[PDB]
RNA sequence: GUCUCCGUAGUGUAGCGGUUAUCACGUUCGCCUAACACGCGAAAGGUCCUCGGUUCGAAACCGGGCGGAAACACCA
RNA sequence: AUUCAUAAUAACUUUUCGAAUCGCAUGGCCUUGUGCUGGCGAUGGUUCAUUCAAAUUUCUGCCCUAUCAACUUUCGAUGGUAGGAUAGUGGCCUACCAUGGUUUCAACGGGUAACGGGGAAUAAGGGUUCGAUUCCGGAGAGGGAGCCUGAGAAACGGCUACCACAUCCAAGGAAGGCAGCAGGCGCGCAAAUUACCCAAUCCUAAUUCAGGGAGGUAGUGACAAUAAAUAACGAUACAGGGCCC
RNA sequence: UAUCUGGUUGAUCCUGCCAGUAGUCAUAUGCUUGUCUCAAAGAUUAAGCCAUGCAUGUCUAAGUAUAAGCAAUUUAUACAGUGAAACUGCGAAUGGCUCAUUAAAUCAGUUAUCGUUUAUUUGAUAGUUCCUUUACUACAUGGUAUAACUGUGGUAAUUCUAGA
């Protein structure tokens, strides 16, 4: 939080992926860590971009305290960020919402149950209902 | 949504307990027609055609051959108001301990009384069980009950009135002496074998206007037995207390480990929970829980739930233990305990070293009275004498007693269902009491 | 076992891929293609661990699906395409053309070539036969089939494939005084000149290739690749040019660089 | 099916575990250098045996041998780097003449004592394990660090330590707050 | 879990509702040596498994509990 | 090194292939018309080569036993001829003919608390023991046999039959092979949760999107390994080691 | 880190064995147990038997739709957007588990296929198929169902199936 001094290293350029990769070295003297939103904010103006155009992960704090090493990415456009950044990091900051597809267990059971019927099942449902009405 | 209650059933031999129970289960969606028709065929080959309804609960070979309910048996049926399961009591002085095990895990009670000429007089006699079974119900914690006058066709005249009014008058005089208010108790005339006045109103007996009850909570007035089962009050379930479920049975189920089964007297049992059985001292984890072939997440108090243990064995586990959460205060072995007991007539005198088969909850064991502390008044715990020399019938007393065999017990203040007990000696109920203090091991 | 195998555990993969042994238990098995699986390089490992352009497996898939790389003129879309020796990957973006040439140490390299050099690819022919309808053809090391070749072209020579048109434009005969490139074996990646050879008409022809520093070594004829005459390489040689310095000379080179 | 990790034992138990002469020797060494477990002496002897075995295998080969020369100087360079061998003893024969005390002297515990910041080797151990001492710009809490004649000038109090300035500390605050409130 | 056959000194194990004792081994005790040893000369050793009654009176008459010795059972 | 690749003759086919498939952008010539030409692709297709492979095969090498010294050939054993079958060579099989083939240089038969190897423990050297177990090559889906589909199976999380097991039965009948991931009984000295995710490493499909108990993560875990708390530092009461008076 | 010791005898020197000693990716068990990293784990006896729940299905710009499914075409009169199910084309013979059988057998190093098959890929590769081949025939193009679906259903049950 004090004297963050975000220094970037190993900067590279990828017109292939429309992104620039760099191992971001951040020092946090007398402070524990720097929050992910913190480095992303000042990552915008050093690369002359916006907040919602950068991506950083890692940040394993060096033993003893006062240093942290992480790897960061910057994307040129919002649409480029959507089409390249993975969904887990998208929902992470503010970029999208993770919809709960129930869980793996019920989906597998539903798939097997749907596999046990040959067709839509509307005729099967009405046939079993008529036969088992009594 | 529908609540859940638990009933037990009681009565004299050949009063029509299992016939009334089984046929009531059949009417309320228990079993389909081909199952009971099979039972009619097999019992006709045996020779006991009348017992086809009794066979539904009496499943054992020795029970069906003899035509005798030896051990208790469970069976469910959904009434109009809520869920309920029955305890089929033996109704014998031979198997009186099995009745005490069944009635101890029951909230309400269905006192079946014979109406036929001669059988009622034999039932309510010195040797009969109608006096005993009603007394044993109030002893173990069955506060509310229902009386059912059975065999109206057999009695003379069948479905008359007088005979019914004579039985209700005779029971009302005795049942007041036990503790039950006969105003609050419902008296229903029925026929178990015929299937009369149980589900629907009877055509054979229009004279019967209708039973009625006068409680503090709410009044009820029904025509049939089924409506009287709906009018039973929801009991007070102590969910907040530490678990104190004395086990009922321990099965080794196919493809799902060891499965301990028992009613949650107190607390909430659930899957993935370590438990400790009290006398044997065996710690183990439960795999899963069930109640009448249906799985459960939360086993609430007063339920026929059944956990399943794991990482151990069926012999380490046993009928009688208390799965007090190995995390919460578990049930410990009792070396000696302060358990007052009042007596209900011991032909012999009660002094010391006398080990009757203390049947606290579901467990029966001989207990020797180390000594007698104080002769106490019949009520309010009033101290009358210091250090008595002997005790007689019709007298209360605090007594410290050492079990002859490892037993688990607990105080009445902590656990009301656990604290109840009776005493038996010379094939008769000599005393009845409650435990206030207990020394752990 | 009851058919082919489509898997590669991350312990039987070729060691020149420079793959680790902790990131997963499997390896990117190359699909069937021009080169063998043990003598080529999948596009996934080349872009993820060599160029470091892509981090994860899906990033390589996204780059490949976006029609960016061009291997031997063809764009290609398979993540496990077996790109081996004499394979040129052209990237329209970043303005770099990459050529797969072995290094002195025994792995692949990231040698950068000009756009003119990427227009032609050298190829060592393996078989010359008279095919159906009487048409002659040659079989290069990459498996390319070129019809109606030069009659002077025989077995164990090298041709200059035009790549863009797929036509032979120049052929280099195999004789003494020819700069070659060893492909495969414990002596792979060495560049030297041929002095003589013992024919040994029982298989496994041997050729005595001599380095520019008077170092001589023996390599089977199946592992050689003529890349030009003496002193003039038809291809831009990688850095070092296969000097093959010893462990002592390498250590002094490091101490003279730090 | 992942590749298994490699593990190795770094100590060798003595063949004769029951001998007064050897028993007193390690007790003297452990007490002088401030060591709790004699496995630490077992460990440091195990490393000595390995390098002696490697150096012995080198001495059975002729001079101007590419294998003997390359590994010989590499082992010699490592030893003189870590400071167990002096500059004038780089001849591959004194390597066989190394003792346990020479290796033990290079431990960070002894160097902290030698530079004069602990006043006792046992106080060096508590200083090591309480994170009051750092190497360069990194806090090290391992007693065995084996400084290599280049970080010896970088041994100093950590910036995040009460002894070397910084925030006063835990028990001091409780005492300071107690006396401040008592006087207030 | 239900049903059946037995329970008796220390090992053996008799024996028999008005009352439990015997028998060998053993268990000790005086005997000698130095400790012995054999040789010897004498006597210490059971709520009749537990409780409850029947009982003038029971361990044995009866029933309950336990122990052991045998069975059949025991899908939340 | 070929009766090799290949070409041409005379025929054989009941006849193989030689595009009736699909998506975008829709452009030019004029004899001004649903006239005539025209791109970037996907799918499929006969043959060759290549690649991922598959199946045979040359040489050498495996534990203990002679209280196993002869083995094989009835009814296949050795070799030859010719033919069937195979995707191919071949007693693989068949018909005929010859009587061969192996063996103290350890055949054959028996036991194996015997899958083999890369390797592991142990030590100066030599060597001994172990190796089911993360990788490679093999066998099996309870014990055998048979077969369809497909390039590839003699497949069992594919079927057919028998035997030993075993489930649902309103007694006619139907449905199964956990030595897959968890979990249950039994066995024993002896060995874990009936959890989460395709986020990584990969594989498969028409394919960037989907699926994968392959796999990864967490939980139980003192199988084995690495480092390392449980204590240190001043002042006072005694007891010292050089030395000053 | 190329090391020994105790025990036959009144005592000595030997042979000789027993015991001691240290290690084990050799297990099992006992007592105790505070921390970080890494991590084996139903093989040994039973390749003994399994309740239950999962473990392989799959599409693009581009095989087939009028879902009597969902939004809007308004660039589209035949759809041409998204798209369940089904047909079709592939995969399901990979992976995973176990070590029962097996002692020139498997397997390891090393050769051959001039003695064979080879999906999928990669690079190439069909001016010649109207057969009295002039009416014998659509080639700005042929024929036939069938699934899904609509409705009738049967059996107690099955990933059971019929008729229209």
UniProtKB/Swiss-Prot annotation, chain A:
HAMAP family: Ribosomal_eS24. Component of the small ribosomal subunit (SSU). Mature yeast ribosomes consist of a small (40S) and a large (60S) subunit. The 40S small subunit contains 1 molecule of ribosomal RNA (18S rRNA) and 33 different proteins (encoded by 57 genes). The large 60S subunit contains 3 rRNA molecules (25S, 5.8S and 5S rRNA) and 46 different proteins (encoded by 81 genes). Coiled coil: none annotated. N-terminally acetylated by acetyltransferase NatA. Also partially acetylated by NatC. It comes from Saccharomyces cerevisiae (strain ATCC 204508 / S288c). Keywords: Acetylation, Cytoplasm, Isopeptide bond, Phosphoprotein, Ribonucleoprotein, Ribosomal protein, Ubl conjugation. PANTHER family: 40S RIBOSOMAL PROTEIN S24. The modification Phosphoserine is found at residues 13, 55. InterPro entries: eRP_eS24_sf, Ribosomal_eS24, Ribosomal_eS24_CS, Ribosomal_uL23/eL15/eS24_sf. There are 2 genes for eS24 in yeast. Transmembrane segments: none annotated. Its main location: cytoplasm. There is a cross-link at residue 20 (Glycyl lysine isopeptide (Lys-Gly) (interchain with G-Cter in ubiquitin)). It is found in: Cytoplasm. This is Small ribosomal subunit protein eS24A. GO terms for biological process: cytoplasmic translation; maturation of SSU-rRNA from tricistronic rRNA transcript (SSU-rRNA, 5.8S rRNA, LSU-rRNA).
Curated annotation (Swiss-Prot), chain B:
Residues 191-193 are annotated as: G5. PROSITE patterns: G_TR_1, G_TR_2. This is Elongation factor 1-alpha 1. Residues 11-18 are annotated as: G1. CDD domains: EF1_alpha, EF1_alpha_II, EF1_alpha_III. InterPro entries: EFTu-like_2 (IPR004161), G_TR_CS (IPR031157), GTP-eEF1A_C (IPR054696), P-loop_NTPase (IPR027417), T_Tr_GTP-bd_dom (IPR000795), TRAFAC_GTPase_members (IPR050100), Transl_B-barrel_sf (IPR009000), Transl_elong_EF1A/Init_IF2_C (IPR009001). The N-terminus is blocked. ISGylated. Specifically inhibited by didemnin B, a natural product that triggers ribosome stalling by preventing aminoacyl-tRNA (aa-tRNA) release from EEF1A1 on the ribosome. Inhibited by narciclasine. GTP binds at residues 11-18, 150-153, 191-193. The modification 5-glutamyl glycerylphosphorylethanolamine is found at residues 298, 371. It comes from Oryctolagus cuniculus (Rabbit). There is a cross-link at residue 382 (Glycyl lysine isopeptide (Lys-Gly) (interchain with G-Cter in ubiquitin)). Its EC number is 3.6.5.-.
Curated annotation (Swiss-Prot), chain C:
The modification Phosphoserine is found at residues 31, 246. Coiled coil: none annotated. This is Small ribosomal subunit protein eS4A. Residues 41-104 form the S4 RNA-binding domain. Keywords: Cytoplasm, Isopeptide bond, Phosphoprotein, Ribonucleoprotein, Ribosomal protein, RNA-binding, rRNA-binding, Ubl conjugation. Present with 573 molecules/cell in log phase SD medium. There are 2 genes for eS4 in yeast. One of its GO terms (biological process) is cytoplasmic translation. Component of the ribosome, a large ribonucleoprotein complex responsible for the synthesis of proteins in the cell. The small ribosomal subunit (SSU) binds messenger RNAs (mRNAs) and translates the encoded message by selecting cognate aminoacyl-transfer RNA (tRNA) molecules. The large subunit (LSU) contains the ribosomal catalytic site termed the peptidyl transferase center (PTC), which catalyzes the formation of peptide bonds, thereby polymerizing the amino acids delivered by tRNAs into a polypeptide chain. One of its GO terms (molecular function) is structural constituent of ribosome. Signal peptide: none annotated. Component of the small ribosomal subunit (SSU). Mature yeast ribosomes consist of a small (40S) and a large (60S) subunit. The 40S small subunit contains 1 molecule of ribosomal RNA (18S rRNA) and 33 different proteins (encoded by 57 genes). The large 60S subunit contains 3 rRNA molecules (25S, 5.8S and 5S rRNA) and 46 different proteins (encoded by 81 genes). There is a cross-link at residues 61, 133, 160, 167, 173, 178, 210, 232 (Glycyl lysine isopeptide (Lys-Gly) (interchain with G-Cter in ubiquitin)). The modification Phosphothreonine is found at residue 114. Transmembrane segments: none annotated.
From Swiss-Prot, chain D:
GO terms for cellular component: 90S preribosome; cytoplasm; cytosol; cytosolic small ribosomal subunit; nucleolus; nucleoplasm; small-subunit processome. Residues 159-184 are annotated as: Disordered. Residues 106-180 form the S4 RNA-binding domain. The modification Phosphoserine is found at residue 183. It holds the Pfam family Ribosomal_S4. InterPro entries: Ribosomal_uS4, Ribosomal_uS4_CS, Ribosomal_uS4_euk/arc, Ribosomal_uS4_N, S4_RNA-bd, S4_RNA-bd_sf. Keywords: Cytoplasm, Isopeptide bond, Nucleus, Phosphoprotein, Ribonucleoprotein, Ribosomal protein, Ribosome biogenesis, RNA-binding, rRNA processing, rRNA-binding, Ubl conjugation. Its main location: cytoplasm. It is found in: Cytoplasm; Nucleus, Nucleolus. GO terms for molecular function: rRNA binding; structural constituent of ribosome. One of its GO terms (biological process) is translation. The keyword Ubl conjugation applies. There is a cross-link at residue 179 (Glycyl lysine isopeptide (Lys-Gly) (interchain with G-Cter in ubiquitin)). Gene3D superfamilies: RNA-binding S4 domain. Transmembrane segments: none annotated. SUPFAM superfamilies: Alpha-L RNA-binding motif. Component of the ribosome, a large ribonucleoprotein complex responsible for the synthesis of proteins in the cell. The small ribosomal subunit (SSU) binds messenger RNAs (mRNAs) and translates the encoded message by selecting cognate aminoacyl-transfer RNA (tRNA) molecules. The large subunit (LSU) contains the ribosomal catalytic site termed the peptidyl transferase center (PTC), which catalyzes the formation of peptide bonds, thereby polymerizing the amino acids delivered by tRNAs into a polypeptide chain. Belongs to the universal ribosomal protein uS4 family. Present with 106000 molecules/cell in log phase SD medium. There are 2 genes for uS4 in yeast.
